[PDB]
Amino acid sequence: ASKLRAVLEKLKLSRDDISTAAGMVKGVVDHLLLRLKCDSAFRGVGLLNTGSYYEHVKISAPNEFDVMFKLEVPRIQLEEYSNTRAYYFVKFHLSQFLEGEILSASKMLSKFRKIIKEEINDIKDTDVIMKRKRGGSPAVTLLISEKISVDITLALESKSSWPASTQEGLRIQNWLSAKVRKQLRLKPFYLVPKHAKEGNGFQEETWRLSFSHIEKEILNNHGKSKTCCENKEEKCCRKDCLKLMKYLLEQLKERFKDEEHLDKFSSYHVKTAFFHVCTQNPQDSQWDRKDLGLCFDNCVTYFLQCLRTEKLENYFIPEFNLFSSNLIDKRSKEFLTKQIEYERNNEFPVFDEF
């Protein structure tokens, strides 16, 4: 009926596209998993599916999938890197990766990337290529059949207690319950080969904490009520609001692709801000389908406040500020503030098709 509901209709994924893309991705991922198990270093890899497709908040087309290839490293000892809260040294067939007693993130990622590159070349039945290494990413990115991108992130799995920098994160007690928080923090955590900033460069030995699996569990079990979105009387608009925030940023980045001020914004910024708004608004009655426009406004104004105050804490690691001036210039946040305010004040013309 409404403008926003019409936008959501256009953002829905086609069942046929899903069927084709799911089969294509599974074939390639399962192949690489099998072949990586042949290498002595990656003998123990397992699959975890992550990101927006597996949280059912992928929009427009199923053409971008995220997966972790995780390895359990028992007796893992961590050392936080230079008070960064999110980046760590890992102290420790893995010997090829040691730089001292440090298990080098870049060394492992390099070898991981090299094995995958050699293995996709032998896939003659399918058209699979490696995309160029994108700086700062822990992923190795594939393109299947010129159309579907798959980001494969190497991860070390730890079944130890989560690091102390997470003690005050995951503030879900009033929304999803204290007992759920306790259950989630008994799950493993992951380290991925995303390196801390060091000057104008990177500390290439360091790893980054990742809780992508907890983000998926929260998105796929997202209500105060256990039956949220399982029946026609409890269809909340939380996922719709995240889809609309993602589309707002996707559209602005496309329009402003030649404007440097939008380069460092990402869908993870809107995902993080969305989790915070869920913490702020914990009741399912604050996400009623009939209030879609108000709920989406709640999300837009929260994100605008994050930009203006330069505060967007990582949801798991509260002293890691994604909107720190060390990461994004004030001028760039003000620029995005300007464009989002324009959309809010004009009923989101960037959502119009014509």
Ligand X SMILES: O=C(CNC(=O)c1cccnc1C(=O)O)Nc1ccc(F)c(Cl)c1
Residue 52 known to bind ligand: yes
Among 32, 45, 192, 336, binds ligand X (CB under 6 A): 192
Tokens read off for 279: 């913490």
> Is position 139 an interface residue for ligand X (rule: CB under 6 A)?
yes
Of 139, 144, 109, which Cα lies nearest the Cα of 123?
144
Distance CA 331, CA 260 (A): 11
Residue placing its CB nearer to ligand X in the complex, 139 or 307: 139
Among 65, 109, 119, 153, binds ligand X (CB under 6 A): 153
Using the contact rule CB under 5 A, the part of the chain among 34-42, 45-53, 209-217, 231-239 near Mn ion is 45-53
Using the contact rule CB under 6 A, the part of the chain among 174-182, 183-191, 208-216, 282-290 near ligand ANP is 208-216
> Is position 151 an interface residue for ligand X (rule: CB under 6 A)?
yes
Among 53, 223, 306, 312, binds Zn ion (CB under 5 A): 223
> Mask 114-153, x = binds Mn ion (CB under 5 A)?
-------------------------------------x--
Buried b (16+ CB within 10 A) or exposed e, 251-265: bbbeebeeeebbeeb
**Positive or negative torsion for Cα 133, 135, 141, 145:** negative
> Is position 300 an interface residue for Zn ion (rule: CB under 5 A)?
no
Using the contact rule CB under 6 A, the part of the chain among 183-191, 264-272, 325-333, 341-349 near ligand ANP is 264-272
> Is position 62 an interface residue for ligand ANP (rule: CB under 6 A)?
no
**Out of ligand ANP, ligand X, Zn ion, none, which partner does residue 138 contact, by CB within 5 to 8 A per kind?**
ligand X
Q: Measure Cα distances from 278 to 49, 238, 271, 284 in Å.
A: 23, 8, 11, 10
Number of residues that bind ligand ANP (CB under 6 A): 13
> Is position 205 an interface residue for ligand ANP (rule: CB under 6 A)?
no
Residue placing its CB nearer to Mn ion in the complex, 190 or 335: 190
Q: How many other C-beta atoms lie within 10 A of the C-beta of residue 334?
A: 13
Q: Which of residues 29-58 bind ligand ANP (CB under 6 A)?
A: 50-52, 58
Coil vs helix vs strand at 344: helix
Distance CA 144, CA 126 (A): 8
Coil vs helix vs strand at 146: coil
Tokens read off for 290: 């009939």
Contact partners, residue 181, CB within 8 Å, separation at least 6: 170, 172, 173
**Last residue before each gap in the chain (C to N over 2.5 A):** 92
Residue 236 known to bind ligand: yes
Where along the sequence are the contacts to ligand X (CB under 6 A)?
Answer: 66, 134, 136-139, 151, 153, 192, 194, 208, 210, 212
Where along the sequence are the contacts to Zn ion (CB under 5 A)?
Answer: 223, 228-229, 236
